[PDB]
Ligand code: HEM
Ligand code: HEM
Ligand SMILES: Nc1nc2c(c(=O)[nH]1)N1C(=O)OC[C@H]1CN2
């Protein structure tokens with residue numbers, strides 16, 4: 157039939173064709189010879205530091221393309237304002253080598269980047285995003301103020317609101333604005349004498365970086381790390397978040413009374429801060445964004461991953477399961493109870509959260525909306541399907557097409 | 573060119589050089605990944621009314637013969653060169669050729685070893701190969717099939733096996749087993765759009781009835797086989813009940829579970845895939861091993877488009893089906909997979925849980941890295957349907973490509 161990828165849902169038997177992928181202008185890591193779709197950090201998108209100013213041409217075409225997307229979103233494609241903005245952009249790049257976005261263009265680009273993220277299952281909310289324009293920020297100290305305002309607004313005392321703060325873009329012949337921390341909220345990871353780790357193993361390096369930069373470490377499993385903010389050409393400055401700004405949820409179980417005694421907990425705000433926001437060729441090296449958690453991120457990955465908190469065995473022992481044999485499914489049982497605890501504790505604390513069933517059901521709805529709206533939706537199957545109960549959620553049975561669209565959120569090298 | 577593959581749990585890294593041996597194209601391109609699609613748009617295996625190009629067939633053949641003599645370390649011997657002579661001579665004159673039993677045995681094992689979607693490949697070297705190429709009727713296929721079943725089941729101590737029927741020929745139709753598996757439960761489309769039994773088998777159940785089968789009306793009625801000999805209408809054969817080992821499901825602690833009347837057969841035998849060896853195609857080559865508990869407990873019994881028993885079990889457990897946040901689905905699912913493991917083990921029937929299975933696959937990935945410099949794996953199929961990140965394969969990056977010998981999908985004969 158149609159010359160576009162044919163996509164099938166095996167639960168419903170329905171079919172669709174992805175025409176949106178025809179708009180992709182950035183190559184992925186796959187070829188007809190082999191699929192590299194399951195690689196976390198394949199070397200393509202990877203926004204490696206490209207110091208020396210970019211080719212006035214490649215920048216222009218990217219810019220023109222973005223401006224077209226913008227005028228199309230407001231329905232003025234081909235108008236005088238559209239042709240004037242195009243002229244104004246190339247004129248800017250013509251003398252300065254770069255250009256700037258109008259306020260409304262930044263808001264549009266930012267939402268679109270979220271909309272284009274193949275690995276995000278919460279995209280049904282893409283239209284509701286608070287965009288804080290912080291392109292006037294000129295110091296590491298101001299960055300901190302902006303971030304604190306972000307955390308405050310986004311947290312909204314448990315009734316979380318999606319938001320993103322955009323700091324100044326990459327400027328040729330000038331340093332980058334960078335947040336060294338992967339997330340605005342991170343638990344310290346202390347490398348023990350015996351080689352083990354106290355706290356969160358994922359954050360061992362950043363923890364040791366904060367220390368080397370004057371941070372006085374603690375010794376708990378849930379110590380909130382300080383922020384390492386870097387302004388152009390200056391060394392990173394250390395900033396401690398005021399405890400009142402970091403909302404946390406102590407974990408307890410609805411029926412297993414001993415669970416509370418485990419002393420487990422997690423913060424309410426998931427805010428990625430080390431990714432690069434790219435719009436029309438312009439690169440925003442510092443643009444932290446936040447939403448709310450899907451229960452499996454905490455209950456399954458963060459708490460049960462072998463290289464993270466790894467509490468599966470502890471809980472199983474408390475539940476008196478046979479951890480000596482796989483066939484007892486002690487891991488499966490404990491994990492289920494841990495995820496339930498996360499859901500229960502967040503609900504009790506009146507802090508926003510969404511389980512993997514509701515999350516994926518709503519993503520299916522997002523897929524229908526996008527099918528009608530753009531003729532498809534780029535999606536990374538391995539990241540969309542939850543870490544537990546895969547085939548129990550609708551997305552498992554939904555084939556997906558993955559490709560790169562811009563604006564986009566990209567990975568970037570560590571500043572150190 | 574060679575992909576860097578990483579395991580995020582251990583931080584270890586390997587480079588896949590085996591993927592360079594791929595000669596067949598997948599569905600992906602630099603523009604977009606289609607790695608999650610179950611079927612190709614047309615990569616299948618088109619008709620065989622005409623002879624395959626001598627140039628192409630000969631190259632696939634020579635490549636295979638090379639693979640074979642290399643496996644027995646006689647790479648270069650006179651035997652090797654003369655076998656190439658034979659194949660060349662046969663293709664040149666007849667437009668095709670035939671395999672020796674030893675080569676066919678090597679090819680079958682290699683096809684399994686190269687199957688990207690198979691998580692039990694650590695067993696790849698242990699495969700009983702039944703040569704059924706001297707078959708000329710559906711009736712004969714049936715006899716071979718029952719022998720395969722009796723041997724593979726082995727009173728509960730399942731043994732991996734494959735039966736290979738006559739290859740495809742340009743001058744005639746194919747030998748085909750219409751059923752997708754040698755053992756399947758009927759799916760009757762009842763008046764109200766409903767479906768009694770396994771919804772996955774509605775179409776094949778109708779075909780059997782269309783060809784004279786007297787249907788039952790249970791939820792687990794073993795279907796009869798529709799075997800097709802070249803250019804002939806398919807024939808109906810009922811499998812001797814004593815050959816079809818079934819396991820009644822009960823729970824180790826929940827007494828009421830058994831009351832549900834759930835059961836599942838012991839032998840998983842795919843019979844609708846095409847086995848390709850050295851350019852030759854075997855349209856009928858049923859193969860079997862043993863089940864991984866999640867295939868039954870999670871997919872077959874819990875998929876919404878299958879038996880869909882999740883809710884019934886939840887209610888029996890008296891769970892809160894009001895909201896999704898109570899995780900009633902996850903809880904019922906775990907118990908169902910537990911009931912499956914308990915029952916098969918009680919009945920002394922071979923089964924493997926998803927933790928043990930993936931752990932063995934990780935070891936297999938390691939063996940293959942040293943042996944061939946890589947291993948094609950389909951991440952979406954390798955990672956189990958429940959407790960994905962609780963297993964080691966989830967954290968393992970994987971490269972997927974097509975190697976030959978291969979098991980491929982082919983069109984439905986009807
Ligand atoms: C509204 C609630 C939201 C939910 C429940 C949600 C949920 C998720 C989940 C489950 C992941 C995978 C995380 C992981 O496994 O590491 C993810 C990834 C992602 N989300 Fe969303 N998301 C939401 C909001 C946001 C917002 C506001 C943005 C940006 C404006 C966004 C951008 C992304 C991106 C870029 C990724 C991929 C990051 C990577 O490649 O590692 N998400 N999201
Ligand atoms: C020894 C026990 C074995 C186990 C535990 C095992 C397990 C599995 C599992 C879990 C699947 C996915 C099933 C599905 O989701 O539909 C699979 C697929 C597959 N297995 Fe294995 N396997 C074993 C033996 C075999 C044998 C003997 C062969 C062939 C000689 C084989 C060939 C394949 C192939 C070709 C696929 C993909 C089938 C398809 O595309 O539907 N397996 N295996
Ligand atoms: N959501 C999500 N899915 C994922 C991942 C991840 O980090 N997040 N990855 C891992 O953690 O390991 C590999 C890969 C597979 N699927």
Ligand SMILES: Nc1nc2c(c(=O)[nH]1)N1C(=O)OC[C@H]1CN2
Nearest residue numbers: 166552553554555610952953954
């Ligand atoms: N094992 C296994 N994994 C799978 C599948 C399957 O059939 N078996 N597919 C489905 O059932 O839907 C899509 C795709 C995803 N992963």
Ligand SMILES: [Zn+2]
Nearest residue numbers: 191600605607
């Ligand atoms: Zn791919």
